[PDB]
Amino acid sequence: MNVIFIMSDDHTSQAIGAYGSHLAKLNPTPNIDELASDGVVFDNCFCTNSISTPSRACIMTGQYSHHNEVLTLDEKLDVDRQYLVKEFSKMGYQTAMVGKWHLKNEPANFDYYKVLNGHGGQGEYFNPTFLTNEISNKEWPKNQVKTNGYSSDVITNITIDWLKNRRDKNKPFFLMHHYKAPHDMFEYAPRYKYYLEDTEVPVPESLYNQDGWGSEATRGKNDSLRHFIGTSISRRHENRSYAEDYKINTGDPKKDTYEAYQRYLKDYLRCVKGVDDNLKRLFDYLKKEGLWENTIIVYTGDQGMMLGEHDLQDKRWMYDESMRMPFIVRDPKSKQRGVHNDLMINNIDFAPTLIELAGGKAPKYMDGKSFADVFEGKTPANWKDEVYYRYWMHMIHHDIPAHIGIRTKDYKLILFYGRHYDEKTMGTPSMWWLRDKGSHKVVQTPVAFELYDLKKDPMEMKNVANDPEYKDVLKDMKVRLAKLREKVGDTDEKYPKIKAIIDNALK
């Protein structure tokens, strides 16, 4: 069967109505939700490394970051590591890649590609330029075309145009359809400027209240690093915030945070609307063409994002809003339609599961395993009850310390080792646009554990690591985290300073 893998950029699960967050009363994704009403909504899908390039590498390879070597936004994915597309080409599929690529190297293993180029692979919201192999008289990365209009509209037209005029109608196709929205700074199409103009976006209480959240690793001893760690919505963080970026000055510091939250969320949801409106045009074409009944469709985001919760922004954090990815699959031949699923899955599991759903076998060389049996009503054999996470990009871009962690259905334990893996990067500025105006440095940050009871406290408001009545859960989770790190091979032999910190904190 055909496969269309749709992925959006920073489209987090709270901003999708089918996940029923406090934002769901705004009805932000009516078309995505309709697809979910005829498919499976995976409630426990998680990123292993919440940034675009590492997450997109885990999806393509089905392997953890330390195995594909794409640790941060600074690394490249080898052309020979394009396992997902290659495995579909082996099965006789024609393959196409459209939209945001962000894997640095050429999508050479795709028969057709037309991917975003400018701004380090992030693209532009208006008149974006693409690198494509329909201009075959040039070579990567000089095979550039220009387009007219808004990126979400242009990208949707590229995919539909390929399906209509370039696709071989007698071969099954595997298409990766990647959007650039709703990425910052959320430059929505001008036709949405007054969408949600007179509607208040529901505000979480964690935006203003953070008592019990965090530790010395994320706030410092006696809250001395509240100005230093974690970019904010309020003017808490001294160097980067939405209140400062939006130049909001009410006189009341709390109303500053509120207005910056409204602006951040409305501009963001305006981009989400543009994606959702475009998907109606794509889904209408697939239905009219008759591909709706023989095409497996996936909607996901490369990672989640903090939408102001705990006065945080962006991703990278292991916190559930950034760690969890939205993941909706419609298998038109499965009886699992209009249901939710609680299975703990990862983005590294996407590739082998999609290979088996298309009539293949889960590749042995991948860390991820197939959960295709879910679409047959079965629980996969010996499936994990825990997930591994690691953010490597210490301090850079958003002043977020590197950390590892493990998450079960009931508990989450985070270990911040607060150090960058590259010694040459230690000591250097974290934000390049403030290299002149005084940015923070990629320095060592306090090492500490954070522990959250996901059944009593799913919003992760209360760190209960120092709590004595959780000290048995604490020792238990520290054991599973050490063996999970051991089982996946992320033992940091390559990095001595980091190995000593993690090994000594676990033992």
Ligand X SMILES: O=S(=O)(O)OC[C@@H]1O[C@@H](O[C@@H]2[C@@H](O)[C@H](O)O[C@H](CO)[C@@H]2O)[C@@H](O)[C@H](O)[C@@H]1O
Report what 151 binds from Na ion, ligand X, Ca ion, none; CB cut-off 5-8 Å by kind.
Answer: Na ion
Task: Name which of Ca ion, ligand X, Na ion, none residue 216 binds, using a CB cut-off of 5 to 8 Å depending on partner kind.
Answer: none
Q: Which of 7, 26, 40, 51 binds ligand X (CB under 6 A)?
A: 51
**Is the CA virtual torsion 355, 361, 365, 370 positive or negative?**
positive
Q: Which of positions 65-124 make contact with ligand X (CB under 6 A)?
A: 73, 102, 120, 122
| CA 329 from centre of chain | 17
Q: Are 64 and 388 in contact (CB under 8 A)?
A: yes
Spatial CA neighbour of 343 closest among 369, 307, 365, 322: 369
Q: What is the DSSP-derived secondary structure letter of residue 42? A: E
Residue with Cβ nearer Ca ion (302 or 311): 302
Considering the complex, state which of residue 122 and residue 144 has its C-beta at the smaller distance from ligand X: 122
> According to CB under 5 A, which residues from 16 to 35 bind Ca ion?
none
Residue 320 marked ligand-binding = no
Q: Does 314 bind Ca ion (CB under 5 A)?
A: no
Q: Which residue's CB is nearer to Ca ion, number 52 or number 109? A: 52
Q: Which stretch binds Ca ion (CB under 5 A): 44-52, 285-293, 362-370, 405-413?
A: 44-52
Over the range 98-110, which residues count as b (16 or more CB within 10 Å of their CB) and which as e? bbbbbbbebbebb
DSSP SS3 for 31 = helix
What would the DSSP string read from start to end of 205-254?
A: GGGT--TT---HHHH-GGGTTTTTSS-BSSS-SSS-BHHHHTT---SSHH
Q: Is 373 exposed, middle or buried (0-12, 13-18, 19+ CB in 10 A)?
A: middle
Backbone CA torsion sign across 25, 29, 34, 38: negative
- In angstroms, give the least distance from the CB of 106 to Na ion: 21
183 is an interface residue for ligand X by CB under 6 A: yes
Count Cα atoms within 13 angstroms, Cβ side, for 81: 21
Residue given tokens 């705990």 in the structure block: 310
- The answer to whether 63 touches 367, Cβ cutoff 8 Å, is yes
Q: Which does 327 bind (CB under 5 to 8 A by kind): Na ion, ligand X, Ca ion, none?
A: none
CB 329 within 8 A of CB 39: yes
Q: Which of 9, 43, 87, 450 binds Ca ion (CB under 5 A)?
A: 9
Residue 152 touches which member of Ca ion, Na ion, ligand X, none, C-beta under 5-8 Å by kind: Na ion
Strand segments (E) across 69-228: 94-99, 112-116, 129-132, 144-146, 173-178
397 contact choice in ligand X, Na ion, Ca ion, none (CB below 5 to 8 Å, kind-dependent): ligand X
Distance between CA atoms of 324 and 305, rounded to whole angstroms? 9
The C-alpha angle 384, 388, 392, rounded to 5 degrees, equals 165
Tell whether residue 9 is among the known ligand binding residues: yes
List residues binding Na ion (CB under 5 A).
151-152, 179-181
Residue closer to Ca ion (CB basis): 9 or 320: 9
The yes or no reply on residue 10 touching Ca ion (CB under 5 A) is yes
Partner interacting with residue 184 (select from ligand X, Na ion, Ca ion, none; CB below 5-8 Å by kind): ligand X
Residue 179: which of ligand X, Ca ion, Na ion, none does it interact with, CB under 5 to 8 A by kind? Na ion
Is the CB of 179 or the CB of 317 nearer to Na ion? 179
Q: Which of 397, 478, 480, 499 binds ligand X (CB under 6 A)?
A: 397
Q: Which is nearer to ligand X, 239 or 295 (CB)?
A: 239
Q: By CB under 6 A, name the binding residues for ligand X.
A: 9-10, 51-52, 73, 102, 120, 122, 183-184, 314, 397-398
Annotated binding site: 9-10, 52, 302
Q: By CB under 5 A, name the binding residues for Ca ion.
A: 9-10, 52, 302
Annotated binding site for Ca(2+): 9-10, 52, 302
